[PDB]
Amino acid sequence: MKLAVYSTKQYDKKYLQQVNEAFGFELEFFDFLLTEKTAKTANGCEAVCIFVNDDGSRPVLEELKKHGVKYIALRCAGFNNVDLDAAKELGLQVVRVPAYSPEAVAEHAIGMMMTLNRRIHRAYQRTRDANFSLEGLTGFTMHGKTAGVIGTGKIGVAALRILKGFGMRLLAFDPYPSTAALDLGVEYVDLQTLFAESDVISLHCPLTPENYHLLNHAAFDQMKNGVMIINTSRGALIDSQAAIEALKNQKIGSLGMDVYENERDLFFEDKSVDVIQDDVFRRLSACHNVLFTGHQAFLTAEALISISETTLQNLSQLEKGEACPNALFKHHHHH
Amino acid sequence: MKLAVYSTKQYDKKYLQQVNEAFGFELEFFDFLLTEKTAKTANGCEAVCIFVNDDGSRPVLEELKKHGVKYIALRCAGFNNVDLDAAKELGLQVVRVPAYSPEAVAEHAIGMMMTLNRRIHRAYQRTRDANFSLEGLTGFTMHGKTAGVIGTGKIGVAALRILKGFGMRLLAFDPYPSTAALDLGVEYVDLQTLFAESDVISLHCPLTPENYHLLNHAAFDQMKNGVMIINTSRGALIDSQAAIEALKNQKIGSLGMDVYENERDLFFEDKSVDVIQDDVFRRLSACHNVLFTGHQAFLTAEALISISETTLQNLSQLEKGEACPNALFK
Amino acid sequence: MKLAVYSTKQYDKKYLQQVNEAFGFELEFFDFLLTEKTAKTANGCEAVCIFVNDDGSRPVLEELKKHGVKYIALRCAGFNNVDLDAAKELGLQVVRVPAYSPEAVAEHAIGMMMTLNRRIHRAYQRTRDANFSLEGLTGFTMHGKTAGVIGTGKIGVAALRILKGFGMRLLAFDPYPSTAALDLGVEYVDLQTLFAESDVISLHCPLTPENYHLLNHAAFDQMKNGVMIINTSRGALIDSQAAIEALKNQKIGSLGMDVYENERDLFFEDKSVDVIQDDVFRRLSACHNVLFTGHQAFLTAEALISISETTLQNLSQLEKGEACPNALFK
Amino acid sequence: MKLAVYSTKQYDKKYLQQVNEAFGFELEFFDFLLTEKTAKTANGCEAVCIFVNDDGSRPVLEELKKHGVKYIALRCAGFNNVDLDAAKELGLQVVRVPAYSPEAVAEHAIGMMMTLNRRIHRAYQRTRDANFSLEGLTGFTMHGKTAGVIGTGKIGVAALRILKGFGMRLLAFDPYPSTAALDLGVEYVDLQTLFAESDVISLHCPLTPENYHLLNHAAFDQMKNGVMIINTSRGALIDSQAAIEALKNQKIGSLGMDVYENERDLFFEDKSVDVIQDDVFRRLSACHNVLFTGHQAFLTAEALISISETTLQNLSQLEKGEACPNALFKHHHHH
């Protein structure tokens, strides 16, 4: 099989290449986005591998079919960029990565928490220029504080295990509480209680209509002053305009956000005047204890390997006519 | 009692003031270093309070006695800056903070590990300027890796609990076993085995004559390529020239060092008769996955309060003629 | 003479030591502020040398007298920190430096202008990380633009020569003409015209009662969209809140400010209050093409050497008992 | 006419769109590199507009011809990326921009000099975070110092005008001395004299066999300690390895280099290594008074507009069958 990979970053290429020693596919790497115009680059490939910014809408799918492509593989969990209804009509098969390594994501959340707490990002900014001042760097001791985790799927639970290690009092909210968490000594609570008592709050849940703007002004009002908020889940979970105010009023002590590529263009203040973010990313980072990372939560060697393994295996199943458990369909509840 | 605080930073002032609400000392804050020249500023204070950079050598103490000081309180664990024998000769009394909050120090080490691992420090420099590129930011998953902790005292144990939460395999080297460490499932091993097997190495031990340059050229040779090394302990535990070389060779993946103020004129490479260089700090930080923090490991609100509480308590005990357990000699 | 130097920076020491060769004085460098409390450190010295942040108030001056000091030498132009008549009464003598090198200040204003224009400060933050992206860095060609200079004294004339070398049209506002500006082909205009026509505006004038908030909201309304504004003069020439607004609505393209230490504490956004901060320096630097320097305009080796020469000489005039032109009274 | 633009950056798009109001071409903007693989995206276009990293080798040109392309426009001065011999053989006409605005380039060189002199880039990194310390920021007064300019074409002369305004003593070297400079008050001198006497040295010359590694170890030894060196000309003008050593030894006070995209990969480390990296850019910037810009010298609105005007005008002349003075041929001397 010949595979064309779009939107390739160096890490994608390295891991896909490394993983491919097992599959022996023919790999063609493209830096650029898949679009209706670039689809013709796929001629002679059976499959394409795409990521979050790639265009999988119907006209792109039509071009891919004209050019002989049969399989579309997303090297990511998100799939909203792909028109599944069109894909079915075209007889095109679509596969994904089900979930990122839970340990990799939870660890990233924890990394963000600590970086913010000890002001390590600021410290490096000084020390790289041999400035050793500590003023404004003071953090807080984690042990004996309360951590609140929103969502107790595998990521949340992986977070909860690290948090326990810190010797934190553990609270969680999930509409469906888990046995694994309960076994860890987590206390399930209502949201309001979680808002009220938590020193650190970490979001590990999918975005559903129930939880759009889950953290709103009313939520911020409920929180402790100086609270730390970490979001490696989707942006919409937070009302960003509320979050900004909370920062100004110093309700939020610290904020860390892992910004999905598909979400950055909003994720804003925001005004219908002039000028907006990206300036907002710059301002917050400068004026507050604010940290953005660029959808980095899965960015470890082991996780990337997993993503590559799953993607190549999915493709292998498709070419072989084996039923692939990662197949997507139009009625999928998260489409 | 009037207390003159030297080398005052904004945090020192804030926490000392807050804690003193329960004590009522008369606090006089000075920004500058205590030296033989500045010691006269203390005239009219029974006590002084000092930190690692302040000069406690015999000539300074001589001036302090001249000027009526009876007590010296180090708002720190280290006392290498104070000449204890001269202090006793002069009839001065010296007290200290015995240990920092073990949790604060260990958490700092963990924070350093995570910032380095995920290149969070590099990431910030990009995103503060709305550069969202991820290339070169690749880390490693902690879970299922081996951590090697050198020293199983209170800090090392506090680190081991966190490292367990990460799901790491646990190794340690200590001349003495800790029951709390054992309870964690820590496997004590010889140092070479720890060097050979450890993905992440963290230093949590006091500097002794036995352990000067504990991490040397041979130690690095033993280590796994890509190893992460963290030092929130004293600098002289690591042979800096050998670490620099290990970085250049790519034996060391990541290095985090919490740089003692008194130790900054070390870590040198160096050259003969040129400057004093902090240029190395700049060079290493640019070239490699290296992080320096400036003796930041106890820098939390809770640890600072504790330091302050202990210092004022030490002083109150002297004033009352009580025996202070934190005295450096009788 | 033994001279004690307060508030010493490395640069003060280096240049002061250099100039001392012609003088032979004994110095005495202190990093700290001169205050009522530290004045006693001067004992043994005939003279002290102070800068802008040092305390020259009456009590400081008494303590200094008590401790045997006769002469106070400023290494700056400004003297509002010092109590003049009080010194007279004490029979204390105080010498200053008349003005800083005009070329050094003008060159700095031009440096600021170009750094802002080409976003050189932004490019460097990218390129230090080996990020070579150009997007957002676009400047404007200077040649053929209109430069507006407010104040045609020595610094302003120095700025004008440079601006002329760039091939700029030259406007100025001064209540007095300078023959040297006229010779450059400078065309004097009313302020409103200068505001209307100028691509680049640079301030080179002292603060007078009649120019406080010269650059105000009405002034900003007159200006071209995208205007670049430089102030190496005193902060109060610009109404800071108006400037912030004009930045927000994009009337001001670029703003460069050399921020006086004694002025830093104002710069009003200005919220009240929780609690006083220069979050504003941070917000402005991030959200716009804004550059702050820390009273850096006179900071060159040649300028420092000059400040050093005048100061030491100023001292010799005193010791010889001869007159000081830079003396602030008899 | 339909024009496909490769390697498009946002400033490129903005100026080309603005300029096109007068031309009325159909513009299609592509972010990615023109390659043999992406050449097919030009189908339906008479022309392409490319920049320094675009691949103009014969296989690409062959593909462009197959897809109907007639004209190739370089929006830059450099042209080594295009195989002119192949272009003639295929009947493809190639045009370029002859030179960049001389004022824009000279002004960039001066801007670098001043930022480096006053350490303005360092000041900003401190002041953006409200750090006002001046230690290490000390400069030198330009007035009364000596400037050496190497190359007296239009850029060098434009640079000399600015430098004259600083009240600098001016020296230059050019194998063919210019009237314009002589009229400025410039003293033409031999190189060793220029090296010996110059406080600031700026390069404004084309790269020739005669001047490859013009600035070498011997050049550096002749220089004044603390010399400032600015290069907005090509990289090969300086022996970088030698420049690094002079920096270590503190022969060079400050160095500014505008790094051509096509030259980025060079600038030797060395040890050739892994092989080859720009940790050296990172190090130099950190350990020394060093500044890189990424070929930013022509990056002003006025200069970009010129580039755009020239580019569209060259294309209209080609479509109209008028002789375009910017046409490139294989016997061109450069090359």
Ligand SMILES: NC(=O)C1=CN([C@@H]2O[C@H](COP(=O)(O)OP(=O)(O)OC[C@H]3O[C@@H](n4cnc5c(N)ncnc54)[C@H](O)[C@@H]3O)[C@@H](O)[C@H]2O)C=CC1
């Ligand atoms: N960045 C910073 O400011 C801080 C640095 N430290 C350093 O880290 C050390 C550990 O702190 P604590 O647990 O409070 O000390 P502790 O005195 O409770 O225990 C020290 C432990 O390290 C062990 N040890 C001694 N020599 C050793 C060697 N060669 N190898 C392995 N282990 C050895 C001891 O047997 C003991 O278990 C301190 O002694 C201190 O010097 C401690 C606090 C803050």
Ligand SMILES: NC(=O)C1=CN([C@@H]2O[C@H](COP(=O)(O)OP(=O)(O)OC[C@H]3O[C@@H](n4cnc5c(N)ncnc54)[C@H](O)[C@@H]3O)[C@@H](O)[C@H]2O)C=CC1
């Ligand atoms: N950032 C820095 O380091 C420095 C800033 N400066 C500032 O720049 C100022 C000027 O320096 P010099 O040229 O040496 O002074 P100078 O006395 O030679 O010239 C002052 C000029 O400004 C004019 N002026 C007075 N009021 C005016 C107004 N409302 N509008 C326009 N012009 C007015 C005077 O008529 C005179 O021509 C200083 O007074 C000082 O405040 C001075 C030295 C260093």
